[PDB]
Ligand binder design. Structure first.
Ligand SMILES: CCCSc1ccc(S(N)(=O)=O)cc1
Ligand SMILES: CCCSc1ccc(S(N)(=O)=O)cc1
Ligand SMILES: [Zn+2]
Length: 257
């Protein structure tokens, strides 16, 4: 099965998921000088006041914090979007070292990690139908740099020891994802894909310019997770990022400057 190793990592994915070589794959390098300021872009509207987290899961690739998406509760709208997108889960990608881990890059800069808040377009009724559509998902991407701790992250960090290995889950209620946002909602946007198999070309990417800071100790705890299941040989969950893919026929637009 696919993963992030030498034998099953990003360069192999195309053999099971040939869309890996498609026309709108993610992530990409954001060349900030060539990104077009678009005065028609609206402010992003992030409405997470009624978000209801339920559980956190080690899926063998990353961990997902899941939300009840059965009502209209935690929604993303505006920005480049038409319509209303409901939060279903967030997860991260991170490195073995502070100098790598993000999926998107900014003028070839890698960040230590990248947060993905995944939302599906309510016009398609549920997530599984949304991923079959070109405007099915909106993923809000936020870079992480190492510096001062992110206090709103610590509840996630502390639960990680209970989901160390593939397939473990733990109740995770009352987690407020507003505590993971930077101060500014200035962003870049472009059309792309899921960054893991099945690599479906269903995502409007919205990547915030301002990173959040997390501490060295917080990222260290991400790196103690394991890609293996309980009772199998330990493989630290590190370097679970896909490298930048060809931009092909796409324009990255900026909401700012
Ligand atoms: C059960 C592991 C078989 S080896 C292998 C299987 C699948 C992949 S893929 N194309 O990355 O999904 C890569 C390596
Ligand atoms: C369709 C099953 C995969 S769900 C899924 C896979 C990848 C992402 S990502 N890393 O945000 O593009 C978001 C959701
Ligand atoms: Zn992701």
């Amino acid at each position: 099965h696919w993963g992030y190793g030498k034998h099953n990592g990003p360069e192999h994915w195309h053999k099971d998921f040939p869309i890996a070589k498609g026309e709108r794959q993610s992530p990409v390098d954001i060349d900030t000088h060539t990104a077009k300021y678009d005065p028609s872009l609206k402010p992003l509207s992030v409405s997470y006041d009624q978000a209801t987290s339920l559980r956190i899961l080690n899926n063998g690739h990353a961990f997902n914090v899941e939300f009840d998406d059965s009502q209209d509760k935690a929604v993303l709208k505006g920005g480049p979007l038409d319509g209303t997108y409901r939060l279903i889960q967030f997860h991260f990608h991170w490195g073995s070292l502070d100098g790598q881990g993000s999926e998107h890059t900014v003028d070839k800069k890698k960040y230590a990690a990248e947060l993905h808040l995944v939302h599906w377009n309510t016009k398609y009724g549920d997530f599984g139908k949304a991923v079959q559509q070109p405007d099915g998902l909106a993923v809000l991407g936020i870079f992480l740099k190492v510096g001062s701790a992110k206090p709103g992250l610590q509840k996630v960090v502390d639960v990680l020891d209970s989901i160390k290995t593939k397939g473990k889950s733990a109740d995770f209620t009352n987690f407020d994802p507003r505590g993971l946002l930077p101060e500014s909602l200035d962003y870049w946007t472009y059309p792309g894909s899921l960054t893991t198999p099945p690599l479906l070309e269903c995502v409007t990417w919205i990547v915030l310019k301002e990173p959040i800071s997390v501490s060295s100790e917080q990222v260290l705890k991400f790196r103690k997770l394991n890609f293996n299941g309980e009772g199998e040989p330990e493989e630290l969950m590190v370097d679970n990022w896909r490298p930048a893919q060809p931009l092909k026929n796409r324009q990255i637009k900026a909401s700012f400057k």
